[PDB]
Design a protein around this ligand. Structure first.
Ligand SMILES: O=c1c2ccccc2c(-c2ccc(Br)cc2)nn1CO[C@@H]1C=CO[C@H](CO)[C@@H]1O
Ligand SMILES: [Cl-]
Length: 148
């Protein structure tokens, strides 16, 4: 595991230094502030703002009501079909560790050691070169364990 950054200012946008081949792990440690409505981790094809970079995997915990996680893909500035997970491990004022495991056909995400969700690839993961973190969240570290 090689961290590309510790204690980043949010929003954070950084280049991923190698390809997300099957078997790659992405590890993100952080904490949800007590007033958060949402945050997201986006695996992107570049960092353009105008027009907005494609988002292969948008991982979006939301804290209203019972809480949920929304996952989606942005292609050519259009969102696709939301996949919503209602069994969410995130909570306001609680710390987490996210592990994203890149498989051949999907991502598999676990939080605090416990399986959270799966998300099938809609953009080839080879096209991902950038990681962004947005919203109301405190991040301790972002790192990669590359299968290369
Ligand atoms: O709600 C936000 C948001 C909130 C705080 C900070 C950033 C954002 C951003 C945002 C915009 C550009 C860039 Br670059 C990075 C983040 N988008 N949305 C909007 O998020 C969407 C709203 C509804 O559903 C979509 C998923 O289906 C998505 O969550
Ligand atoms: Cl697979």
């Amino acid at each position: 595991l090689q961290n590309i950054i510790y204690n980043p200012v949010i929003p954070f946008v950084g280049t991923i230094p190698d390809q997300l081949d099957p078997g790659t792990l992405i590890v993100i440690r952080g904490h949800v502030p007590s007033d958060a409505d949402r945050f997201q981790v986006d695996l992107q094809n570049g960092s353009s703002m105008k027009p907005r970079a494609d988002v292969a995997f948008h991982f979006n915990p939301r804290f209203k009501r019972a809480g949920c996680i929304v996952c989606n893909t942005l292609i050519n500035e259009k969102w696709g079909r939301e996949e919503i997970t209602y069994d969410t491990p995130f909570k306001r004022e609680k710390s987490f560790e996210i592990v994203i495991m890149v498989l051949k056909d999907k991502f598999q995400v676990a939080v605090n050691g416990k399986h959270t969700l799966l998300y099938g690839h809609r953009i080839g993961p080879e096209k991902i070169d950038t990681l962004g973190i947005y919203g109301k969240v405190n991040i301790h570290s972002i790192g990669f364990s590359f299968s290369s």
